Amino acid sequence: DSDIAFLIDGSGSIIPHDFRRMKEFVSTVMEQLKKSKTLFSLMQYSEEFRIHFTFKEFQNNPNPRSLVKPITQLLGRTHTATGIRKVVRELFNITNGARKNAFKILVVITDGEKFGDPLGYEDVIPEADREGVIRYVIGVGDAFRSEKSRQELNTIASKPPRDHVFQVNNFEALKTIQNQLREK
Numbered sequence: 459d460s461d462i463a464f465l466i467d468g469s470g471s472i473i474p475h476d477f478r479r480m481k482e483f484v485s486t487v488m489e490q491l492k493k494s495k496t497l498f499s500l501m502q503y504s505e506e507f508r509i510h511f512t513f514k515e516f517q518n519n520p521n522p523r524s525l526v527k528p529i530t531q532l533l534g535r536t537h538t539a540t541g542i543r544k545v546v547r548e549l550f551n552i553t554n555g556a557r558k559n560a561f562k563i564l565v566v567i568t569d570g571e572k573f574g575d576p577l578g579y580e581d582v583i584p585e586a587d588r589e590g591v592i593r594y595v596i597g598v599g600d601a602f603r604s605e606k607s608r609q610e611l612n613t614i615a616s617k618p619p620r621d622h623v624f625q626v627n628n629f630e631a632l633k634t635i636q637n638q639l640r641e642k
């Protein structure tokens with residue numbers, strides 16, 4: 459009943475230590491929220507986009523650590539808004555494994571510093587809302603130490619953002635989220 463996608467920031471601003479955290483967070487979530495009726499998908503982004511595993515591919519090999527271990531950082535710019543648009547349109551595409559009727563959950567992991575992207579959030583959020591894609595934002599790096607980046611997470615996250623935005627090293631975020639998913 460749940461299709462869960464991850465949009466992970468692979469741009470250059472993302473320090474290697476932090477990209478690893480992103481992969482460790484994603485792997486743990488998959489292992490924790492592993493429900494017989496829950497599929498996972500992941501796309502990495504910078505200026506270019508990469509679907510590491512579709513819902514179908516996960517359904518064919520539900521081994522989190524196996525799917526996440528080969529993932530290498532793309533580097534480059536940060537086209538977050540475009541990435542969100544591609545996720546809803548490409549990941550939650552039934553030709554990719556997405557199931558009609560299932561709840562749509564997107565976990566966006568970034569440092570909150572969109573750059574180079576020709577699209578603004580205001581261009582991709584309405585469509586996400588329209589597709590009923592619930593958004594969780596996990597902030598890595600200095601995402602919370604800047605006024606700009608802090609608001610970027612709030613802008614991406616569903617309402618209320620305070621209930622949808624977590625720090626990557628708040629190891630208690632997965633249980634809060636999981637607790638929340640019982641209230642879809």
Ligand SMILES: [Ca+2]
Binds near residue numbers: 469471535536571573
């Ligand atoms: Ca970046």
